[PDB]
Amino acid sequence: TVPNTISWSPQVALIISASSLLILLIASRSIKYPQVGAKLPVLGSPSVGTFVASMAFGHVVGAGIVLGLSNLGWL
Amino acid sequence: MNISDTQVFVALVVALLPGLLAFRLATELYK
Amino acid sequence: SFMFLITWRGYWQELIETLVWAHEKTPLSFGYWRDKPVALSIVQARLVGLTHFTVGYIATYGAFLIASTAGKFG
Amino acid sequence: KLNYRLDTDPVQPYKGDPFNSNFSTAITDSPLARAFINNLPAYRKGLTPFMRGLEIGMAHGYFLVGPEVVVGPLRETAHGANLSGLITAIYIAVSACLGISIFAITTFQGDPRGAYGSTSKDSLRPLRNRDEWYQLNGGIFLGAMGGAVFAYLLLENFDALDSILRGGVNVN
Amino acid sequence: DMTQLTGSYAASWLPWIMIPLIFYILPFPVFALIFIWIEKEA
Amino acid sequence: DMTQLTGSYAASWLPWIMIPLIFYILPFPVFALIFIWIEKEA
Amino acid sequence: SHTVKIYDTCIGCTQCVRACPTDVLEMVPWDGCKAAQIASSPRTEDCVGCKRCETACPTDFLSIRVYLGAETTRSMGLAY
Amino acid sequence: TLEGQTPIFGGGTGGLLTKAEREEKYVITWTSPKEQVFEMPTGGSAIMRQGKNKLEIARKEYGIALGGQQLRAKFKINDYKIYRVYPNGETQMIHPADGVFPEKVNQGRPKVRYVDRNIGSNPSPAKLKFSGVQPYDAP
Amino acid sequence: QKVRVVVDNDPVPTSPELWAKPGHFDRTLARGPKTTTWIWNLHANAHDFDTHTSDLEDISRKIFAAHFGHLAVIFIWLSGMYFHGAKFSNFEAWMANPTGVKPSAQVVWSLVGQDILNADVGGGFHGIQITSGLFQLWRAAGITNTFQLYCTAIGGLVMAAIMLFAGWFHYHKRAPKLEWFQNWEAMMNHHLAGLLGLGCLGWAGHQIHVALPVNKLLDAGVAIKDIPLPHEFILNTSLMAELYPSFAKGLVPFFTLQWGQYADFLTFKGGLNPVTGGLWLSDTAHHHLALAVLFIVAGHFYRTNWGIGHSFKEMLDDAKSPNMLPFLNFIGPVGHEGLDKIFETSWHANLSIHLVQFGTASLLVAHHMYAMPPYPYLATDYATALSLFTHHVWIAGFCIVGGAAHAAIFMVRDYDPAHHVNNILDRTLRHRDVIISHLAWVCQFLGFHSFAMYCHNDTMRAFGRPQDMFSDTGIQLQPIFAQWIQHIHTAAVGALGTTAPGIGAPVSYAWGGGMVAVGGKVAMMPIALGTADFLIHHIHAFTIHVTVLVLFKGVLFARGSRLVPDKANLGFRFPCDGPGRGGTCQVSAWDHVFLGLFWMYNSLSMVVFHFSWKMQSDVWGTVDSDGIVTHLTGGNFATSSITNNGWLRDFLWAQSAQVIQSYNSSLSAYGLMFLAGHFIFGFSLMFLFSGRGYWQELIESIVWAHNKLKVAPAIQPRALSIVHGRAVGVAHYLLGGIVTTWAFFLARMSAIG
């Protein structure tokens, strides 16, 4: 059978936003070389490259999470 | 239906891994 | 024969040296050469390769000559 | 600036000599490998050369019978397969013992060449005397014949031994 | 039949050889190994 | 019959023993003799 | 051992001595050439027969010649 | 005995064999101005010490190649010596034979195996039949 | 800031003056010729750039410019195939009747009777039947008329001119610095996300928007003229909606992560299309789309200019004891530290790795394209299927040998002992006797227990004792591990239970699950493995291991050995070190490549022979109305391939009937080339068996005759050098043998395929 994919709803927006946010806090404190290049609070003051990397990885991880949940009936 | 010939042989080969590690731990504790 | 005629000595001498090391370092191998093993000489290899080439030449055609005639006739 | 880091090297030079063409590995120098190899009959301390040959012969003659019994050309019949296996072990061991004899004849003339010379320090080849080799050979031959015959007797009596190991001899 | 030891389980030949090996073949060599270990001079 | 090696010639038992003797019985002792001959110290 | 001979056509260019991988040759005083020196082979027992000396010799024909002879352990280049 | 401390080397399979203990062995000793990395004659890299060094080698060609192509050409070290060590302990210094490098002419060195003619004047082998004399050895 | 573009301006003037100075790149060759050896040396050192100069920056610029030249050559070759398929082919006729028309794209002129080679290939066309699979590739791309092929031919010529201009521009006008070439992280990011990733994405777009709709109509049976042009599927969205309903809702599901609604054209079926026998194009579209995402993600892995990413140097410096797994700590306390120096300066080391992986890729291409035929009407075109597997097997073998060759070149030329102190490279060299001795032993074990068992079979069969043979009816050698894998992979899709539930059909029918037939011929069916397959696979293991032994001994001993300790000073390519030390012929690392070429040829010849016989015997054939399959050779492989008398009789003698009887027919060219390959093989034997000392002396007498008539040349004739004679021998040997097999394979398949 074709794995189930759900229609767009605020829940998938919450998952993607939360995954992007959590990655942003973790990356600014764990990656080897943050604050490299042009600069953009509670965060570690990440650079532009760190922020775009966090948002891109938030889309990557978030997309995997939403498709994984929707496949299994929310895991 | 019980396990087959291959399953018994696989278990025997797998049991070698804790067998060798048991020897390593025993000799290390003897030190 | 193609092996003895195409490959030449220095390749085999280096390989034999590796096997010499292996024998010396292997336990339970109580044997030991009284004559040091070396690759066949340059001239010797040409003769040995020529011998294999000739013997194969004669044996192959001899078998074909007999079979293709005796099999078809008396 | 230069750090060979030999002190933290898992693989050390063999016996502290970096120029002896050897390494200290799990195969050559681990406590288990040394214990197993040095206590084989070829290396066990204190063994007489005849007793070294006896234990080696019994072990080798015993298993040499097997191959021709199972996949040999007389395998179609039980009795023929067993005889062929015993003969093959006898032929191989007699040939090997002949090789051991002529090895001792040719090696030990004057000061032997190679690893059996007086000044040689080959720890893997400890039988440095001609009389030791002949004592070894006598043990090898008698042990190999005994081991081959022992395997032959067990295979010849396979039907009896199968009933033995299943308790079928306790019916009467 | 019930005149002999048999096994309907897979690889029933295994107890045929393992019982002799563990109980009256290997134990004497094992005792020999332990005896050498406990008698070795310092 | 043609299920075994036989001989209609006289003394057909001769190849029965000569073939083993020359090809896989005597050759190893002969090789041993030659080996001793070519390895003898001067 | 191999035999190494030096003929009177030598010009004392020392090329053969430099090319020898086992130090068989050395340069000795001489008066037959402008360089006032000639090649010598005092240590032919160490000669392996590589003929590197002949390759380096500039004279025509060669002033140094190697004749392969009886083979020994060191003439065969055996480390065992 | 030969003095000097061996270079840092973790071991290898290109070292000495039974021939070293049974027939003969060679040792190359030298002095270097600093600690530095060189290539072993039979593969691998070794670190030569600050003071005087001593390396055991299976063949004489190893010492000539190491001393000539590496010690002199690359590290500008010219005081290296090569010894031949016999199993009974006898040691003789063989390179340089007389303290002067062979490529440099030295007084007192005799002519060895010199033929007083051009190579084209060697006699034909037919004239020396059954005499046991090779054409290049002919007077 | 670290990654930046720096170039020189006009570093080399563009003048043809040096065109009239042959050998200018070499100091020795620049003086001019004195003997004929100068001519050979000029061509031999033409592209050895590191011997033209010692400047790494100048060398790298030559690499970059020359690569553009090779790309232009490939584009001209690609343009030729498209043009010949648009002007001198029966492509349009073949597209109408794929199962009844032989592809043909080469037409010969009629001057000396060679027009007999214009075979009756069907479709009212006369020409040489091609086996390159161009027609099947173009059909899968959606190409339906010769005009589209003509346009691609013009585009290929344009790209060739652009490639040629780029090489001139980046060498004579704007040559990048050495630091530009040393940007590992930037190069990896751009070639992963931008080259592989964007190319997969672009081809996925072409497949989705062009190939899938055109091929869906083609398999439905509608005529070529009734199929709209591919751009109509883009403009008229209603046309795409009818074929795939999901296209009626646009890009909304993609941006909302509702990708499950795209399942009608991004399928995950597996198996083969019943109509054509190739893979489902919708399956390949999802395959390439998934590849594009994976490659683009991989392209953000390395740190270029923004701190984010991984560093090559930090990984290599960290991969050492005790940071490895407990059983992998034997690599020592230095480990991979120092390997980064190799990739900074050694072009040869990188070429060694990349040539090896092109061998790996081409081998995967050969194996994965017959068992999972990706193009329509490719599996049932037996001539094309055999040719494609054989061609890409041979390409891989040459690439692998080249990888070993340039690995040895790196050791002699670029390896620096100071950079490798107790690291893994140094440690590997320090136990090379361990490695070679064990490799030599396993080669002997494999040779005895693979080939000598065939000799055992031949002797038993000749004795009239089939029961004693290694066969399915005698002493069986069942490849149980390979049989088990076939069962696991078949049961994974539902045909250790159902481990790939989403796949409908078996991934490959070669593992089981059923048979596919297209035009009354077998496309793919399960390939049973028995004793004969056990024996032949261990033949491959034996031949590969020996080829490894020859090449890997040369690389490990390139610097020297116990015999010649200073081989590195002698160089990568030298004939010998004299007759001394007993004789040191062929000690150089080059000679190990020379010997390894023969063993690669021997290994790969048996690989393509195994494929040709097994596929004909057990897979390929015709299917009647009742579903009964009669194979091309009728199942000979199981009983005949267990002896090499069977190989000699039932494979070489029997299957050469087509090529040997091809005279006075359209296949007569294959018969001529069959003899041509045999001639070159025998011709090569005098270069391999003889030496230049004989030939130089013979040339002396010939030169005397020319001197007698005052016609001797100033450029003195010389026999080929010792290395050159070996190179000629191996080149003619491999050419003769491969051409012989090429004619043997193609003549038979063009007649019975």
Ligand code: F6C
């Ligand atoms: C004498 C004694 C001795 C000894 C002991 O003591 C030995 C041992 C070893 C070890 C260590 C090893 C493992 C084993 C195996 O697997 O392989 C083999 C097999 C066999 C079978 C071998 C054989 C054994 C013995 C000889 C036995 C004998 C017995 C008989 C029976 C006698 C008979 C007599 C009569 C009279 C005939 C080896 C080896 C090697 N080899 Mg080696 N040996 C020797 C001898 C010889 C000779 C003569 C030659 C020449 C031919 C060689 C050769 C060779 C090569 C190529 C190689 C290889 O590769 C390998 C290796 O290294 O790896 C790694 N090698 N070795």
Ligand code: CLA
């Ligand atoms: C995304 C960027 C990108 C892309 C696509 C490439 C692509 C390529 N590089 Mg490359 N490179 C890049 C960035 C890129 N590079 C960067 C940033 C550096 C500096 C670190 C290098 C440094 C470099 C070196 C040093 C070398 C290459 C080489 C190559 C070629 C390898 C041969 C091959 O696979 O043939 C692929 C075959 C093709 C036909 C691909 C198409 C070729 C053209 C030029 C691509 C044009 C794409 C462009 C976007 C236009 C698209 C139009 C349309 C699709 C929209 C290939 C064309 C090698 C080579 O052969 O040089 C000539 C080589 O030696 N590159």
Ligand code: CLA
């Ligand atoms: C990407 C691929 C690639 C690249 C860039 C190189 C690059 C290089 N290789 Mg290399 N090589 C490769 C693949 C590659 N190789 C492969 C696959 C092999 C295995 C066969 C080799 C084997 C190899 C050897 C053994 C040697 C090199 C050498 C060299 C260097 C000098 C080039 C040279 O001699 O000009 C080539 C000049 C020629 C005259 C060759 C042309 C003659 C060929 C053999 C004719 C082929 C016949 C034809 C295809 C079919 C018949 C034609 C018809 C008319 C009958 C250069 C760095 C040489 C060197 O010194 O390296 C430092 C060297 O000794 N390579």
Ligand code: CLA
């Ligand atoms: C601790 C667990 C345990 C115990 C108590 C037993 C008990 C028994 N097994 Mg057994 N077995 C086990 C685990 C165990 N099994 C496992 C995991 C396997 C799969 C590898 C097997 C495979 C197996 C076979 C194939 C056979 C038996 C048989 C037997 C019986 C005779 C003894 C024998 O031949 O041993 C044989 C033992 C092995 C082949 C391997 C044993 C491996 C275990 C894990 C070792 C345990 C060591 C222990 C924990 C350390 C003790 C410490 C000390 C201080 C006491 C006996 C009832 C025989 C039988 O059925 O007779 C009727 C027989 O033929 N066993």
Ligand code: CLA
């Ligand atoms: C050179 C002559 C010659 C040759 C080639 C053969 C060949 C053969 N004989 Mg034979 N034979 C010969 C003379 C010869 N015979 C003579 C003169 C006699 C009478 C004494 C015999 C009596 C004889 C018997 C009784 C048997 C054979 C058998 C055989 C076959 C197996 C070999 C064997 O068992 O030898 C056995 C050989 C002998 C018992 C004695 C051989 C005496 C000859 C003269 C020795 C010649 C030595 C030679 C000249 C020196 C070679 C030098 C070297 C550099 C090559 C083989 C076809 C066997 C057979 O038929 O199998 C089917 C068999 O059973 N032979």
Ligand code: CLA
């Ligand atoms: C995993 C890689 C992969 C695979 C399996 C395929 C598979 C396929 N492609 Mg495809 N392709 C790929 C990558 C891949 N592609 C890339 C990267 C590009 C360019 C960006 C393309 C461009 C492309 C075009 C333009 C076309 C195809 C087509 C096809 C189909 C025909 C069969 C074929 O090409 O041989 C299958 C190939 C293989 C099995 C092996 C090659 C894959 C690479 C080279 C191996 C790389 C791994 C390497 C050995 C290890 C690297 C070292 C490691 C340390 C990482 C088939 C479905 C054709 C089509 O439409 O079919 C209907 C077609 O026209 N492909």
Ligand code: CLA
């Ligand atoms: C058919 C011809 C032939 C044969 C049999 C061999 C055999 C061998 N080659 Mg070889 N070679 C050949 C042609 C051949 N080569 C050619 C044409 C070339 C040129 C390219 C080379 C180049 C070459 C190289 C470069 C290398 C080899 C290596 C090897 C060895 C591989 C190990 C092996 O298989 O051991 C098993 C031995 C065999 C399979 C030989 C056949 C044995 C028969 C079938 C059984 C005999 C039974 C019994 C012992 C007979 C005794 C009776 C008594 C009366 C004599 C082996 C000795 C490699 C090596 O030495 O690796 C260790 C190696 O490095 N060869």
Ligand SMILES: CC1=C(/C=C/C(C)=C/C=C/C(C)=C/C=C/C=C(C)/C=C/C=C(C)/C=C/C2=C(C)CCCC2(C)C)C(C)(C)CCC1
């Ligand atoms: C290393 C090891 C191993 C192996 C082992 C082996 C290899 C074994 C073998 C074993 C064997 C192979 C054994 C054998 C034995 C034998 C015996 C025990 C015998 C005895 C004999 C006898 C007792 C005899 C007697 C006699 C005589 C003397 C004379 C008269 C007659 C008679 C018969 C009485 C394993 C893998 C497991 C594990 C790991 C480790």
Ligand code: SF4
């Ligand atoms: S035969 Fe040729 S390759 Fe061999 S050593 Fe003599 S010159 Fe060199």
Ligand SMILES: [Ca+2]
């Ligand atoms: Ca009873």
